[PDB]
């Protein structure tokens, strides 16, 4: 697979492509070198480093604003910035008492804000122009991952917390869900129905297991299921952690990346494994899609899965781009 | 605080489909000593203590 030119110097933790409101395609990446980077992707795959910004702590999550003019960052320095791209100016819009793990843009018919999930056990909402959060919500534990598709939001916490929020008029809790996985939550992604409305989410743990959960299925005992993944195998089977999960925006099928250095494509309706790649020299840390699903990006970096004894600061961190949306087409 | 204890993949059992298999778990937070923190938390602490 084709590399991205001038990749960061440390491990990558998040990826995010540009919205459809922008011409062309653009990729954002956050690394543990406290830097945020941008690449203009050509139709031929050639990547052009466009800009860069820096935090005082490792960047954990990134996202775009709806109109394509801003890029939001979440760092371990307990803050979060807004990055105007035409002027290349980054100011602070968010403050926390602990590292910020998740960041999302919420485009409601009646408001628009930035959501920040942090390890200080809270969930704040910012209007990008005032220093006070317009709303603060309480989490029962540290925030590990999240996702936002109006009018639905899902947040996974430590101690296997799982909360679903409604966003109409103003955000608030909808229901706290007993987790269908019995290990540490890690990544989550929301999928929609045939009428383009959010209906459920996909939860991934560190135990090579991903759960499919619908909000209101007719028969949840048979509709909601859990499946194994990212396990390399008479002999013991190595169980690796799921580090990221994202859905194809056109075909409704999903992809998964794990500590096994592989990425797999899945169909949850037919309940089938579409593809599984080769074993990269190091685990795959993050992934995402572009706006029309024709570009699948995934980053090859260390994930601290085996501790600090296995961190090699000289192994090259790569970002790969795969122009295969038809590998995710169902039959 | 930090990955000061050496990694040791915990052992387990499971079935696969139709037989009985054994499992090694290749995640440091699957051990009892790190079950209360995440990977990013442990990694962040090893950085601030200059244990890279």
């Amino acid at each position: 697979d084709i590399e991205v030119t001038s990749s960061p110097d440390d491990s990558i933790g998040c990826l995010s492509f540009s919205p459809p409101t922008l011409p062309g395609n653009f990729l954002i990446a956050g690394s543990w070198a406290n830097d945020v980077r941008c690449w203009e992707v050509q139709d031929s795959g050639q990547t052009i480093p466009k800009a860069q910004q820096m935090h005082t702590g490792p960047v954990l999550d990134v996202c775009w604003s709806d109109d394509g003019s801003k890029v939001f960052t979440a760092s371990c320095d307990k803050t979060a910035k807004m990055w105007d791209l035409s002027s290349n100016q980054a100011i602070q819009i968010a403050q926390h008492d602990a590292p910020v793990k998740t960041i999302h843009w919420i485009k409601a018919p009646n408001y628009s804000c930035v959501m920040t999930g942090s390890w200080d056990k809270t969930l704040k909402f910012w209007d990008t122009r005032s220093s006070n959060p317009m709303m603060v919500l309480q989490l029962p534990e540290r925030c590990y991952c999240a996702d936002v598709i109006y009018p639905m939001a899902v947040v996974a916490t430590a101690e296997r917390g799982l909360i679903v929020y409604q966003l109409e008029n103003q955000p608030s809790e909808f229901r706290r869900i007993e987790s269908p996985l019995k290990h540490q939550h890690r990544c989550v992604a929301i999928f929609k129905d045939k009428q383009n409305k959010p209906t459920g989410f996909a939860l991934g743990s560190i135990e090579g297991r991903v759960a499919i959960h619908y909000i209101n299925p007719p028969n949840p005992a048979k509709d909601n299921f859990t499946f194994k993944c990212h396990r390399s195998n008479s002999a013991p089977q190595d169980i690796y952690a799921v580090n990221g999960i994202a859905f194809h925006p056109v075909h409704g099928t999903l992809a998964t990346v794990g500590s096994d250095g592989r990425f797999s494509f899945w169909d949850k309706d037919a309940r089938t494994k579409l593809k599984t790649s080769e074993q990269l020299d190091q685990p795959i840390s993050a992934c995402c899609f572009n706006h029309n699903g024709n570009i699948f990006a995934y980053a090859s970096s260390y994930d601290w899965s085996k501790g600090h004894e296995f961190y090699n600061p000289q192994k090259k961190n790569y970002i790969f781009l795969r122009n295969a949306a038809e590998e995710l087409k169902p039959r | 605080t930090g990955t000061t204890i050496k990694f040791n993949p915990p052992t387990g059992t499971d079935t696969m489909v139709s037989t009985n298999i054994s499992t090694k778990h290749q995640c440091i937070t699957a051990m009892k000593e790190y079950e209360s923190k995440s990977l990013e938390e442990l990694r962040l602490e090893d950085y601030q203590a200059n244990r890279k």
Binding site: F225, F227, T272, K273, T276, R331 | -
Partner: peptide
Amino acid sequence: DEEQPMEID
């Protein structure tokens, strides 16, 4: 590679 059925619990 080719299509395989999911390993579901």
